[PDB]
Amino acid sequence: MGPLGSPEFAKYARALKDYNVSDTSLLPFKRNDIITITFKDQENKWFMGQLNGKEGSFPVDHVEILLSDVPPPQPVHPVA
To answer: Which residues cross the membrane?
Structure first.
């Protein structure tokens, strides 16, 4: 064994709580939300994800990572 070859990566994520952002460049959402990880950033600080017509970023302080890439049961209600 020379180089470390291991399956250490991600694919999907689920917001653990509500997140807010103020810069027209982030991705705000609510608890229990599946954040479709579209592009990892620091794999520890910020994360580029997107969901219901939303695409931006969010800190790891409130988002889990789903390696199995399985779609969990999520609610759907467009606020008006």
So the answer is: none
